[PDB]
């Protein structure tokens, strides 16, 4: 037999690459392309692939892009250096809100003004002074760390969905195997150009506004026997939650410099009220009993205890939640107060704390200040999942947890993998001299299909964001040219099928013509002879396509 | 661009003249297109160079798949549709400029390309060379 060169071979390799950031065509948006994701999903019949949501670079890539766009939005905003002064505070007489006085900087640098603003106790750090009941002195939290930046008017906290799209030459494989646990084989896969839109919703403990499971509740973890891993629970039903801050604050504007202002909380309209969340009781209870049972399947002969918060540090103990730019730290200890034993009105009130100083993304010194928001601050959302951490007592104790934002994205991106298409390949023949739809079928069947299908590959012919696009285009060109070049030197113009003068080595494969062509798919073949790739290429370029020209044409002198 | 012929298989100076006259001129003139082969300012230049490369390669690629190396004139096996244009050989070649023609048959661009790449330049290879096994 003889080596035949094929172009358009439906095989791929796992590969990492920068994906395009696509936005909403109807539209932190200037960086992304507002196009149609065109989710022309194709199912690959009879194809099984290995997915691993814990090693998915799309998650890491998203983490970086979410942070980067978020940071750009604060770039032109005011650094509140003038507020890192002694604050004289008194109790508001209109127990978490204090009335503080400052000597602020005026438009003129040689003048100061005495101004006041209201603050939440959580954002204020006492100096070496005690509560006297009338007055005491304070520092703003983080004045010993960073010049915290005020969010600008029109900074958007709208979790506008992001779509990731493959560069030409790459494809995104989606796992449709309902109940797939995030690792191992998926026996139902399909390919897309783009992912569904993912809303970069930021939270801890309770995952909000995501995609619900198609089947039953699925519990996923990198390692279920590792008590240091986060367990992601995907609900198949949403639970209604609505949060509100019913205390009518007024926004004041204080000049703190030559062309800049600070937005201060003040003039509380009459009543003092605690912020809270409204959670349906029957749905919460049903949800945990159902989660309990699924956990029991993973942890049999154990009592399940969804009974404890983290321990007391607000940053990790409460539910980090955003509402229209407002920041809530809600106490969920009343939700996670139950057990499960497999063989044994009507709402829930969650009190919430409000804080204006935000250590976003767990970074230190990258501080944002949230200005007060006037009006009806109420947000209604869907709990779609849980982040649980498993803790001797023949009991599996669980606590809600989080803070690693990657888990909020693994929870959506677990369905996707990125691979690189590798159109060249070889196989023996007896003759001497929608792209991946032909996958899961034998090489023979594909070779017929590819006489047409191979041409679908021809469809592939802001600061750092400008660079990401340039690298993407340059790489696409580079790979294209390398393949064109190899085909050129091998004498394979008319590349879909190219017979050559290189003989087949039984040492590469000793399978018969029909054993190979009718009992293997192209990927199986690629693996079986994969380490002879360089050998074959040398035989084709250094010998046969040189000898076949020199011994025929130079003789024509 | 394309136009019907009877045969089965300074760049813009030839403008304002008929297609016929230009087709003679272009046997030479077409080659003048071959002459085309700081922060944000660095980016503007890179985008410009990358685009020039991209457009070049797309045209080279189309000509390759249509079997049109020696590209200045390339006859094909795709028949002319009277539905694209029902003008006669001389009515077209001697009474139109290339831009007028481009407008008259402009929406058939994708049709013609498909006929050339998916059918005629596939069929013309498979039915002649695979038989040589």
């Amino acid at each position, epitope marked *: 037999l003889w080596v035949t060169v094929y172009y358009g071979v439906p095989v791929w390799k796992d590969a990492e690459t920068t994906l395009f950031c696509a936005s909403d065509a109807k539209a932190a948006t200037h960086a992304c392309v507002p196009t149609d994701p065109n989710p022309q999903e194709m199912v690959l*019949e*009879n194809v099984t692939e290995n997915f691993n949501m814990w090693k998915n670079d799309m998650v890491e890539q998203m983490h970086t892009d979410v942070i980067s766009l978020w940071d750009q939005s604060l770039k032109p905003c005011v650094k509140l250096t003038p507020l890192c002064v002694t604050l004289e505070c008194r109790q508001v007489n209109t127990e978490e809100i204090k009335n503080c006085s400052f000597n602020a900087t005026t438009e003129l640098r040689d003048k100061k003004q005495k101004v006041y603003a209201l603050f939440y106790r959580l954002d204020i750090v006492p100096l070496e002074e005690e509560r006297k009941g009338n007055s005491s002195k304070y520092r703003l939290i983080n004045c010993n760390t960073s010049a915290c930046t005020q969010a600008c008017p029109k900074v958007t906290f709208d979790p506008i969905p992001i779509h990731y799209c493959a560069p030409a030459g790459y494809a995104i494989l989606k796992c449709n195997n309902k109940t797939f646990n995030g690792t191992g084989p998926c026996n139902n896969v399909s390919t897309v150009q783009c992912t569904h839109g993912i809303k970069p919703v930021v939270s801890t403990q309770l995952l909000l506004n995501g995609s619900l499971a198609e089947g039953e509740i699925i519990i996923r973890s990198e390692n279920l026997t590792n008590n240091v891993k986060t367990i992601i629970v995907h609900l198949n039903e949403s639970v209604e939650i609505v949060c509100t801050r019913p205390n009518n604050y007024t926004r004041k504007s204080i000049r703190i410099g030559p062309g800049q202002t600070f937005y201060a909380t003040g003039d509380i309209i009459g009543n003092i009220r605690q912020a809270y969340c409204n959670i349906s009781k029957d749905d919460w209870i049903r949800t945990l009993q159902r989660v309990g049972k699924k956990l029991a399947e993973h942890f049999p002969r154990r009592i399940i205890n969804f009974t404890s918060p983290a321990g007391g540090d607000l940053e990790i103990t409460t539910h980090s939640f955003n509402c229209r730019g407002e920041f809530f730290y809600c106490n969920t200890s009343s939700l996670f107060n139950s057990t499960y034993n497999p063989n044994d009105s009507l709402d829930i009130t969650i009190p919430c704390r409000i804080k204006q100083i935000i250590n976003m993304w767990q970074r230190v010194g990258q501080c944002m200040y949230a200005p007060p928001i006037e009006g009806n601050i109420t947000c209604k959302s869907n709990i779609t999942g849980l982040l649980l951490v498993r803790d001797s007592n023949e009991t599996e104790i669980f606590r809600p947890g989080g803070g690693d934002m990657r888990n909020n994205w693994r929870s959506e991106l677990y369905k996707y993998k990125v691979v690189e298409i590798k159109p060249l390949g070889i196989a023996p023949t007896r003759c001497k001299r929608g792209f991946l739809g032909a996958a899961g079928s034998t*090489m023979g069947a594909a070779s017929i299909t590819l006489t047409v299908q191979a041409r679908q590959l021809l469809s592939g012919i802001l600061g750092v964001w400008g660079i990401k696009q340039l690298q993407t285009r340059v790489l696409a060109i580079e790979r294209y040219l390398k393949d064109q070049q190899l085909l050129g030197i091998w004498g394979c113009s008319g590349k879909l099928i190219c017979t050559t003068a290189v003989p087949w080595n039984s040492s590469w494969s000793n399978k018969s013509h029909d054993e190979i062509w009718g*009992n293997m798919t192209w990927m199986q073949w690629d693996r079986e002879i994969g380490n002879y790739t360089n050998t074959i290429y040398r035989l084709l370029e250094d010998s046969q396509n040189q000898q076949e020209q020199n011994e025929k044409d130079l003789l024509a002198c | 661009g394309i136009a019907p012929t009877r045969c089965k298989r300074g760049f813009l100076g030839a403008a304002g003249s008929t297609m016929g006259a230009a087709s003679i001129t272009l046997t030479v003139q077409a080659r003048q297109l071959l002459s085309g082969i700081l922060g944000v300012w660095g980016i503007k230049q890179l985008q410009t160079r990358v685009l020039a490369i991209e457009r070049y390669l797309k045209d080279q690629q189309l000509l390759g798949i249509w079997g049109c190396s020696g590209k200045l004139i390339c006859t094909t096996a795709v028949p002319w549709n009277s539905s694209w244009s029902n003008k006669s050989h001389d009515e077209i070649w001697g009474n139109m400029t290339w831009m007028q023609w481009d407008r008259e048959i402009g929406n058939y661009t994708n049709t013609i390309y498909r006929l050339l790449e998916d059918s005629q330049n596939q069929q013309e290879q498979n039915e002649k060379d695979l038989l040589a*096994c």
Partner: antibody, heavy 126, light 109 residues
Framework: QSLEESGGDLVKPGASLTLTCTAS?????????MSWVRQAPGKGLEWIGC????????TYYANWAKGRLTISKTSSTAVTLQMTSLTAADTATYFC????????????????????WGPGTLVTVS | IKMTQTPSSVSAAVGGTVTVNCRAS??????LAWYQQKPGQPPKLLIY???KLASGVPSRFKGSGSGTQFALTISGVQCDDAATYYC???????????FGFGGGTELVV
């Protein structure tokens, strides 16, 4: 393993037809070419076409029935022979069969096996 | 495809031999097959690739050929089956569908 076949009846001339061939005791997999033929009195089997299990390719002799013949995969165990206008159906009977080919690696394949056959049926008109 | 056959019918003494000739116009590189069709039945495959005996088929059915001329020889012949013997061929490609089957020969011995 055997093939069952049904759906033929007497229909108006020029009427459509959907015959179903069923994989009794099996499903169709790699290299299973599920084909149809026409058996006229005094003749052999004229080729209609076939489909490839594991893919969506459907190959048929359009030179006989372009615009008249569609061969469609349904279940993993069945194929439907779809006709848009019947004439010759009143002469030749239809049979479904499970066959296989050898691939050349040059973009095509040749017939080898037709091991399972359905009982067949005549579909006439009037 | 373009193919012919000869004869239209055959006969033999019982226990003797029968020859059926498949005469393609087209040059075929050993890709044809022989079938036996008993009345009321789909044809049964007898021979693969012009000469390989199919499983379940007796040694009585043998044959060979090349190019355009192929033949089935039946030896130690009985016509208990009262079958018509046929020649089959066909090739799949994306540009052309090359298929056919002969009229076959009816055998009585």
């Amino acid at each position: 393993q055997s093939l069952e076949e049904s759906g033929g009846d007497l229909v108006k001339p020029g009427a459509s037809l959907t015959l179903t061939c069923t994989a009794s005791g099996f499903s169709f997999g790699w290299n299973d070419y599920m084909s149809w033929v026409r058996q006229a009195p005094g003749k052999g089997l004229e080729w209609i076409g076939c489909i490839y299990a594991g893919s969506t390719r459907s190959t048929y002799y359009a030179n006989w029935a372009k615009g008249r013949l569609t061969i469609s995969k349904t279940s993993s165990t069945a194929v439907t022979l779809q006709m848009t206008s019947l004439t010759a159906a009143d002469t030749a009977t239809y049979f479904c069969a499970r066959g296989a080919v050898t691939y050349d690696g040059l973009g095509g394949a040749y017939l080898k096996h037709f091991n399972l056959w359905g009982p067949g049926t005549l579909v006439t008109v009037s | 495809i373009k193919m012919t056959q000869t004869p239209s019918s055959v006969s033999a003494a019982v226990g003797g031999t029968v020859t059926v000739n498949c005469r393609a116009s087209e040059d075929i590189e050993s890709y044809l097959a022989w079938y036996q069709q008993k009345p009321g039945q789909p044809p049964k495959l007898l021979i693969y690739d012009t000469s390989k005996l199919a499983s379940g088929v007796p040694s009585r059915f043998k044959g060979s050929g090349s190019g355009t001329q192929f033949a089935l020889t039946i030896s130690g012949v009985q016509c208990d089956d009262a079958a018509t013997y046929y020649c089959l061929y066909g090739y799949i490609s994306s540009d052309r569908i090359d298929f056919g089957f002969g009229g076959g020969t009816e055998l009585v011995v």
